[PDB]
Specification:
The structure is cut from a larger assembly and holds 8 protein chains of 8 kinds. By secondary structure, chain A is mostly beta strands. Chain A is about 5% helix and about 30% strand. In chain A, the strands form 2 sheets. A 3-stranded antiparallel beta sheet of chain A has the order 2-3-4, with no helix packed on it. In chain A, strands 1-5 form a two-stranded antiparallel sheet. In chain A, strand 2 and strand 3 (about 45-50) form a beta hairpin. Chain H is built from 5 helices and 8 strands. Chain H has helices spanning about 15-30, 40-50, 85-90, 105-110, 140-155; strands at about 5, 5-10, 35, 70-75, 100-105, 130-135, 170-175, 180. The chains are: A mainly beta, B alpha+beta, C alpha/beta, D mainly beta, E alpha+beta, F alpha/beta, G mainly alpha, H alpha/beta. The interface of A and H includes residues 53, 54, 55 and 56 of A. Bound molecules: 1,2-dipalmitoyl-phosphatidyl-glycerole and iron/sulfur cluster (3 copies). 1,2-dipalmitoyl-phosphatidyl-glycerole binds next to helix 1 of chain E. The site of one iron/sulfur cluster (SF4) has 11 residues of chain H, from helix 2 and helix 4. It is classed as photosynthesis. Keywords: photosystem I, cyclic electron transfer, photosynthesis. Cryo-EM structure of cyanobacteria NDH-1LdelV complex.
Chain lengths: ~70, ~110, ~160, ~55, ~190, ~150, ~400, ~200
């Protein structure tokens, strides 16, 4: 995983975590399988950009999958 | 409280039409598909839309009656309508007073 | 500076910080001494509560809530101000209300609860004013997933 | 005239009086004149008898 | 008790005098001419600072992708390809949507080779929004001049009047830009 | 008022392209546009400033680039010719088509001769261009406006 | 129809349309006759999420958004968002640029004070200040369209180093003509209220805001001066050389609608005096004298230097801000505007906390609407001078 | 199929009926009663036309606050999704010969709030059928008068024999759900609250 690579978000760790508390118990279909951009990696988190008109989010390193 | 969410094509009313009006009732959800003359319809694709609406209202179980879940159901219904339009099915009609492509423009595959 | 010695004069142990560029200085209280610090600060001055901000130190870090206090005079040159920092974790966002001392943040705590999701104990009316009341989730977090709607997608 | 030379408008009726511009293109007897005022580049068209060439 | 009656009578005659003064200023307001303009018969004169449509040239372009980062929405797209015969890139297509445009003229300022231009067009009314992706050969057209149209009447705004005019409708002289242009000051003084 | 008869239809069927002078204060070409539908013509509103090139939009297919915000990649949409696809699934009675341009002031005289030749090449659609007009409703041949 | 008149209190739901001059606000009024007991305000129909916009955005891409924050003046938010990075990085500003900045800020404050007494006098009586106030504001519209290009907020005009553009040739002369003409128009508006019928007696005791309650509720702006507190923020902190001219803060004794009217009426004349002294300043005169002294004299002898320039230093489009937080305060037309900005050595900032001036003053509206009549509701709502784009944001 | 989103394919008149149709269209062209709906600075730009500088009244348009005696609605401003059913009900409570003019860049499309936004509605054409669009942020009042002129050019295209289009079909469907009952929302109860005077 580097700056500007294809990313895929899995839904196996987002059941009981700190990122699942702010989420409203459901997930959109574009977050399961699709295309996503990696903006930058500051520390342990990474910025994920989606093709929908939606502001960028922040996920962990052990929550993604390369494709 | 009359819970409803409509944009241009789907109308999910949380009541029951007796003759021409509605009453507040949390037991019946009435669906109206395409009230304005924007898309021409048939009996098979409308039945598929009704079956998808029944599947979506059977999926949402054990939740509170709020505007967010009903708007999400209406958004999934309009996404199903848009994917049915993109599948190679019925589209616009040249008989209205205004012609505005709100879902998409006719394009070429190849 | 002087506000740290004023807090230490009445036997209060706080964490002292410095100045960012010029002017303001920060005093960090975590969960318990906030009411005592506000009670011994209201007697000297600071009768005009300025504002209350809330942010994150990181995507997996804790909530930081900064109150801005400033003393009031009739006609002064430069009255000194101060900031009070509350470092509360996101597992239990419990910050006590200061509505009974100052009535300025009666809606600021409501706005912070709508934006980030901080539960304020002792609030008369803590509901949704910016977001709809049927809308769930905090939109101003570092990890906020937006549900797909017909009006929220791109315009074709 | 040629596109790429400096001209000057000399019409006393218009608001732009003696303004140096840059000719962009010529079609239908109309000349596109690009003015340079401040930090924005405006383009106001004129006629072929309105402008005068200035070296 | 009588002093309250005299105060009420004084307030009543003062209210009657105020009603008479309001009638007097209302009758005074009928003497002045209307200061409105007709459309599309008396169109206003656009100033040199008033912006409009974005004009694009296909000749003085290098496809450097600089003004895209200046735009907050990144509306001008650059369809550039890589050629192996030359050593630079060439522009193929240029499209820009105008329904989401802010019209602030920020991409025109950050341009060294002045590839974008300001065009005095504001009359944009279309029954559909899908045609707003304007082509470069559509943006390369000639703007509509308000002077050359013989059916409209040119009339300047408030700040384009000689020596100070409060109405600005007759304009019997041909003077404009109240002040002095900085060319004769170097000749006389 | 003025009780207008059926004279614009004969002038449109005789020539191939017409130019009518309307007052820009309101709307008066709607009466002729309704009389054309009463005679059996299908109207098509279109704006003359935003068209790109006439050949690549009326005869061949074009490629539209939608304005992306950096979220999506660079995509191209294949647009067919407008009057050809409007002429494909057209006819209830198979009489004729018209093309109406609203603001014909922001155009050049180079493509007008090409449009007047294109409306004479295929005898199934007409070309109606609107000019800002001078105080009266009058019709003129577009080829005479090109030649003079 | 089923209208059953009972002996229960009637809940009046004022819709969020408000089709006179107001925005979106759902007011639920609970009463039992010809008074007002309870009032519930509901907002949320104009919130656009500005704080999520500045999460990934630079300084050159945030100018139309920060100008579309408040749609009354707009240039105060631009002035604080060009003051926060120049104080975070330590970039100086020329004196003539700050003179142009304070001239444009006071000229927008004039129009912001002009757009308060229109609907406030329209909802209480005769509807004939409307056309004349709109003509007097259209004069400012034409002046700003001749100066910069637009009539209001859609105007960038500000960078980190300074102003990118300059004034035109006749703008100072038309501004002097506007200061010549604006004074009898405000003397007429003060003579409309200094000798009047029951308009003075109608809004005379409806607010009654005390001093300590206004301090505890956190009131900032003209209401704090109407209560009798001299807390003008331009006198506490000198913003851009504010200690060079003569100043006078209008202070009212009691806090009501008439006092809040006459404070802004006097503040119009104070702003006219400030822009007149600013025209009396301007060390170098208009653009004609500056261009003549530049083209007549030498290249770098006496005139062309550092103080008298366009910007002074061309800033980079993608520049890095230093790590740290910053807070500035500026007295606006509604109240005090503040920006709490946090940078962490990156192009996009981390936290953009916005301090709205009307959202803190809207808390007095549940206290103000208590025990009053039905016709005083719109006057009370118009007297605070709140904006839905500032309380929703 | 090779064609995405296809379009489905869909005479002697009298002179007196034509003149009656011209009179019926001229009456709607002459009256043209609008509705003033605005939530932002576009409402101020509309109110600048009502003043005695541009004279928007002279075409026949009079300001009315009633969404029942107006054959034309003018939506204007940034539209929040909480205001979208309000706009839908305000459009539906109008009479049947209604027209829509959308003024503004954030009204006809997403505008500036199309990059990073979760509350602004990206386009009013998803809510109400727009007849005449109007780009601009903010547009000139002369451009609003030009949109009025184009709307007047579009009204005269209507017919008196093809008047059978201003209606809505039934297409009713009845189904059941299994949702839980919700507690009610707050109506008032701000000042005389038991948690306000008594500190917990
Ligand atoms: C040639 C014919 C000219 C006839 C013109 C007369 C028609 C004018 C009638 C007025 C209609 C409006 C009434 C509103 C009046 C209004 O709203 O304010 C009425 C005002 C009420 O004041 P307050 O509310 O302070 O009073 C009640 C309180 O005091 C409670 O304690 O005072 C009056 O009661 C006095 C009424 C005197 C009214 C005088 C009217 C006549 C003035 C013109 C006299 C003209 C002489 C012409 C000589 C050539
Ligand atoms: S218009 Fe200018 S900034 Fe944009 S690609 Fe062309 S040369 Fe570069
Ligand atoms: S004016 Fe602004 S919004 Fe429009 S294209 Fe230029 S940079 Fe983008
Ligand atoms: S288009 Fe511009 S002027 Fe109109 S509401 Fe949007 S930001 Fe305001």
């Amino acid at each position: 995983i580097k700056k500007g690579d294809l990313v895929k978000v899995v839904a196996e760790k987002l059941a009981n975590s700190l990122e699942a508390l702010a989420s409203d118990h459901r997930y959109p279909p574009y977050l399961f399988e699709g295309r996503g951009e990696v903006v930058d990696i500051r520390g342990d988190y990474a910025q994920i950009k989606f093709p929908v008109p939606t502001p960028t989010v922040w996920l962990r390193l052990d929550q993604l999958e390369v494709a | 409280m009359l819970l409803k969410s409509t944009t241009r094509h789907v109308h999910i009313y949380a009541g029951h039409v007796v003759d021409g009006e509605v009453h507040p009732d949390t037991e019946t959800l009435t669906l109206n598909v395409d009230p304005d003359n924007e898309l021409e319809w048939n009996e098979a694709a409308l039945a598929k839309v009704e079956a998808k609406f029944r599947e979506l209202v059977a999926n949402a179980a054990g939740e509170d009656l709020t505007e967010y879940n009903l708007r999400r159901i209406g958004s999934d219904l309009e996404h199903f309508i848009r994917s049915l339009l993109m599948q190679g099915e019925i589209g616009y009609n040249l008989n209205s007073r205004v012609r505005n492509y709100s879902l998409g423009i006719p394009r070429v595959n190849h | 500076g002087p506000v740290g010695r004023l807090l230490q004069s009445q036997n209060l142990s706080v964490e002292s910080l410095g100045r960012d560029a010029s002017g303001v200085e920060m005093i960090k209280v975590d969960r318990d001494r906030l009411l005592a610090v506000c009670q011994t600060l209201y007697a000297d001055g600071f009768n005009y509560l300025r504002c209350q901000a809330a942010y994150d130190s990181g995507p997996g870090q804790d909530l930081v809530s900064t109150y801005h206090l400033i003393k009031l005079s009739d006609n002064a040159d430069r009255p000194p101000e101060v900031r009070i920092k509350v470092f509360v974790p996101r597992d239990d966002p419990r910050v006590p209300s200061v509505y009974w001392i100052w009535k300025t943040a009666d809606w600021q705590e409501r706005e912070s609860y709508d934006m980030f999701g901080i539960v304020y104990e002792g609030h008369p009316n803590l509901k949704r004013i910016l977001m709809p009341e049927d809308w769930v989730g905090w939109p101003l977090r570092k990890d906020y997933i937006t549900p797909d709607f017909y009006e929220l997608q791109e315009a074709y | 005239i040629l596109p790429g030379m400096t001209v000057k408008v000399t019409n006393p009726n218009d608001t732009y009086y003696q303004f140096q511009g840059i000719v962009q293109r010529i079609t239908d007897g109309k000349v596109a004149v690009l003015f340079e005022g401040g930090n924005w580049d405006k383009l106001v068209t004129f006629q072929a008898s309105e402008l005068e060439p200035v070296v | 008790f009588l002093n309250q009656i005299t105060n009420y009578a004084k307030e009543a005659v003062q209210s009657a005098k105020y009603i008479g003064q309001g009638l007097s200023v209302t009758f005074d307001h009928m003497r002045r001419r209307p200061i409105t303009v007709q459309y599309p018969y008396e169109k206003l004169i656009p100033s040199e600072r008033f912006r409009g449509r974005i004009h694009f040239e296909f000749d003085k372009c290098i496809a450097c992708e600089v003004c895209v980062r200046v735009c907050p929405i990144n509306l001008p797209v650059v369809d550039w390809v890589f050629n192996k015969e030359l050593k630079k890139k060439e522009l193929k297509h240029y499209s820009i949507d105008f329904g989401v445009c802010i019209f602030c003229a920020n991409c025109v300022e950050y341009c060294p080779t002045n590839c974008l231009s300001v065009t005095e067009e504001y009359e944009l009314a279309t029954y559909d929004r899908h045609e707003l992706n304007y082509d470069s050969v559509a943006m390369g057209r000639i703007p509509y001049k308000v002077t050359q149209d013989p059916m409209v009447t040119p009339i300047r705004e408030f700040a384009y009047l000689p020596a100070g005019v409060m109405s600005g409708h007759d304009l019997p002289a041909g003077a404009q830009r109240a002040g002095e242009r900085p060319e004769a000051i170097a000749n006389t003084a | 008022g003025l009780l207008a008869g059926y004279q614009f239809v004969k002038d449109l069927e005789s020539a191939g392209a017409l130019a009518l002078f309307v007052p820009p204060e309101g709307g008066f070409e709607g009466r002729y546009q309704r009389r054309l539908r009463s005679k059996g013509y299908t109207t098509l509103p279109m704006s003359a400033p935003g068209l790109g090139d006439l050949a690549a939009y009326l005869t061949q297919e074009h490629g539209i680039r939608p304005a992306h915000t950096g979220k999506e990649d660079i995509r191209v949409y294949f647009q067919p010719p407008l009057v050809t696809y409007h002429l494909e699934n057209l006819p209830p009675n198979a009489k004729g088509l018209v093309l109406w341009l609203i603001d014909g002031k922001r155009l050049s005289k180079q493509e007008f001769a090409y449009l007047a030749q294109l409306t004479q090449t295929l005898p199934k659609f007409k070309v109606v261009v609107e000019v800002g007009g001078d105080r009266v409703v009058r019709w003129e041949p577009l080829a005479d406006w090109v030649a003079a | 129809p089923k209208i059953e008149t009972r002996t229960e209190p009637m809940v009046i739901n004022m819709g969020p349309h408000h089709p006179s001059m107001h925005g979106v606000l759902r007011l639920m009024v609970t009463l039992d006759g010809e008074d007002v007991i309870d009032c519930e305000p509901v907002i949320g129909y104009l919130h656009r999420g500005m704080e999520k916009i500045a999460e990934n955005r630079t300084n050159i891409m945030f100018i139309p958004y920060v100008s579309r924050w408040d749609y009354a003046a707009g240039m105060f938010n631009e002035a604080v968002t060009v003051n926060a990075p120049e104080k975070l990085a330590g970039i100086p500003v020329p004196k003539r640029a700050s003179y142009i900045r304070v001239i444009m800020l006071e000229l927008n404050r004039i129009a912001n004070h002009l757009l308060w007494l229109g609907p406030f006098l329209a909802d209480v009586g005769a509807q004939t200040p409307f056309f004349y106030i709109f003509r007097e504001r259209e004069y400012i519209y034409d002046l700003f369209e001749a100066a910069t290009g637009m009539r209001f907020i859609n105007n960038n005009y500000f960078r980190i180093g300074g102003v990118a553009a300059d004034l035109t040739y006749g703008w100072v002369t038309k501004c002097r003509d506007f200061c010549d003409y604006f004074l009898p128009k405000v003397d007429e508006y003060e003579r409309l209220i200094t000798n009047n019928p029951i308009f003075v007696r109608r809004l005379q005791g409806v607010g009654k805001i005390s001093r300590e309650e206004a301090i505890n509720w956190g009131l900032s702006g003209p209401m704090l001066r109407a209560s009798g507190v001299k807390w003008d923020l331009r006198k506490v902190d000198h913003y851009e050389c504010y200690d060079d001219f003569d100043w006078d803060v209008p202070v009212a004794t009691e806090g009501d609608c008439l006092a809040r009217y006459i404070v802004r009426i006097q503040e119009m004349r104070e702003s006219v005096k400030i822009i007149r002294q600013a025209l009396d300043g301007l060390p170098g005169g208009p653009y004609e004298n500056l261009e003549a002294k530049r083209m007549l004299e030498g290249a770098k002898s006496e005139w062309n230097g550092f103080d008298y320039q366009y910007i002074g230093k061309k800033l980079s489009p993608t520049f890095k801000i230093p790590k740290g937080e910053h807070y500035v305060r500026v007295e606006s037309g509604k109240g005090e505007l503040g920006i709490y900005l946090i940078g962490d050595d990156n192009v996009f900032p981390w936290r953009w906390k916005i301090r709205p001036p009307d959202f803190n003053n809207l808390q007095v509206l549940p206290q103000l609407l208590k025990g009053m009549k039905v016709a005083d509701i719109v006057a009370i709502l118009g007297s605070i001078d709140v904006i839905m784009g500032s309380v929703d944001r | 199929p090779a064609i995405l989103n296809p379009i489905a394919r869909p005479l002697a008149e009298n002179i007196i009926l034509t003149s009656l149709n011209d009179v019926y269209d001229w009456a709607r062209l002459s009256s043209l009663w609008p509705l003033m709906y605005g939530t932002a600075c576009c409402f101020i730009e509309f109110a600048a036309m009502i003043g005695s500088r541009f004279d928007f009244d002279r075409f026949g348009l009079v300001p009315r606050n009633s969404p029942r005696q107006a054959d034309l609605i003018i939506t204007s401003g940034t539209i929040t999704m909480k205001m979208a059913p309000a706009l839908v009900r305000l459009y539906e409570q109008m009479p049947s010969p209604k027209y829509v003019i959308a003024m503004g860049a954030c009204t006809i499309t997403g505008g500036m709030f199309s990059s990073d936004s979760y509350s602004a509605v990206r386009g009013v054409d998803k809510l109400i059928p727009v007849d005449v669009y109007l780009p601009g942020c903010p547009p000139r009042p002369e451009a609003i008068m030009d949109a009025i002129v184009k709307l007047r050019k579009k009204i005269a295209n209507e017919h008196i024999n093809e008047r059978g289009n201003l209606a809505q079909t039934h297409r009713l469907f009845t189904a059941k759900h299994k949702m839980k009952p919700v507690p009610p929302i707050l109506t008032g109860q701000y000042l005389n609250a038991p948690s306000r005077q008594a500190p917990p």
